[PDB]
Amino acid sequence: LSASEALARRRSVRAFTDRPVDRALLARIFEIAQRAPSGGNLQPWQATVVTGERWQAVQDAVAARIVMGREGFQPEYDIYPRGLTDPWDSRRFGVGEALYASLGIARDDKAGRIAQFQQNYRGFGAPVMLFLHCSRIMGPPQWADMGMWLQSVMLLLVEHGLASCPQECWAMYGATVRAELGLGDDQILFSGLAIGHADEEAPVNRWPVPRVGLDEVIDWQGF
Amino acid sequence: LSASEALARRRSVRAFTDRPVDRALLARIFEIAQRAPSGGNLQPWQATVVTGERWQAVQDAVAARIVMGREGFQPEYDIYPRGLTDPWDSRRFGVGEALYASLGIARDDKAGRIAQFQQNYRGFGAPVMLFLHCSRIMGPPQWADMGMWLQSVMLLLVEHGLASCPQECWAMYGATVRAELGLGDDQILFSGLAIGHADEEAPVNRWPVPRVGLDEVIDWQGF
Ligand SMILES: Cc1cc2nc3c(=O)[nH]c(=O)nc-3n(C[C@H](O)[C@H](O)[C@H](O)COP(=O)(O)O)c2cc1C
Ligand SMILES: Cc1cc2nc3c(=O)[nH]c(=O)nc-3n(C[C@H](O)[C@H](O)[C@H](O)COP(=O)(O)O)c2cc1C
């Protein structure tokens, strides 16, 4: 599988089969993903990978927070910018529209879409959850470094016939997640990464995901 | 070239040939790179790509700042964390020594380190410079998004027989660069990316670049 093909085939998978992930395979993928570049070769990314009973504990701990409602939230940071405007805000809901449409839940049906949302905290049934975190001394460019590493992993997973869904929803309960994992407060949780084998027949995995055109992204000067 | 191979063969290239870059190739690469994921599909990354006369104008404007010395600096942000410590600093010093050894530039050699500094602001002789920037409303997770896009770009270049060097050195003169590109102060410059055909005979492009072992990266729980 070529780099181009891996990139095309990578999507956020929100339906996984009940099927284990070979840990030896995982380690080899992390080995190669470490070749991601970073400012000053700092390699600021740290990861805690969980499965089985530990993965079950994290889910339980967060579930206990979820039923507290808005009172239970523990945001690591502002997931979205507070002053978010168009064109960006609309991009969120365009993808949202497609996702829920691909399922069998109406637009107005606020009850059912909530239910599917909570599936996030089961990692959409993935056997493995990766938690990506770093020291709180790190600034924005090191967060960009983390992104380079995370995309490397996601691409490598696809090349090896695995799949993933990156999840910032975990940062909504950062302290609970950090406490459950045994991470100290010197660390900040950025994102989770659900990892497993895709259910390739699941409709939620088959809808075409949109992107803006290059005219909204790239300016050419001097050509 | 497989995704694994692309990741392994990508390095920060600091010597380029005069061979021109097919814009048609670049544009197709960007089309694919847009498939990078982002939190909420915000796709926050923006890029202004420059070549030819406009590219030299940017160099000229920044060069005007360099001769001002420490007064010429216009930091967009802290490139390295204030209060950086080990293990990360040690990682930096490792690649630094390696890079300078390949150039034949000594510790005492203040002349060469300055020249090497100045070479950064020529994009190391690359025919095309990409400037990655975003709205100033974006937060750290959106900077991670930019990182996912940028690594996507760097891998695709390598797949197509091209090469790159990510460059935060441009952020040192952000306002000069943004002013020259015609960017407003609503935008913040993250990084440059030099793009072109690598000079593979160049020793600076040939030394083995270090990475820490997975024992410093991944914690396994529940296996
Ligand atoms: C950092 C990050 C966090 C994400 N978090 C979530 C999440 O918590 N829940 C979710 O359903 N999708 C999440 N996503 C997936 C995005 O919604 C998705 O990347 C975007 O819609 C593009 O679609 P695609 O990745 O399937 O191509 C996340 C993506 C990124 C990059
Ligand atoms: C965001 C970013 C900015 C960078 N800026 C520079 C730079 O200004 N000058 C430079 O020589 N290298 C720069 N680099 C290259 C790093 O030093 C390099 O990625 C790291 O040493 C690992 O080496 P490699 O990319 O060749 O594998 C940058 C890398 C990243 C990710």
Numbering used by the authors:
A (entry chain A), B (entry chain B): 9 to 231
Copy out sentences from the published article reporting this entry, exactly as the authors wrote them:
Recently, the nitroreductase NfnB from Sphingopyxis sp. strain HMH exhibited metabolic activity for dinitroaniline herbicides including butralin and pendimethalin, triggering the initial steps of their degradation and detoxification. The homodimer NfnB is a member of the PnbA subgroup of the nitroreductase family. Each monomer displays a central α + β fold for the core domain, with a protruding middle region and an extended C-terminal region. The protruding middle region of Val75–Tyr129 represents a structural extension that is a common feature to members of the PnbA subgroup and functions as an opening wall connecting the coenzyme FMN-binding site to the surface, therefore serving as a substrate binding site.
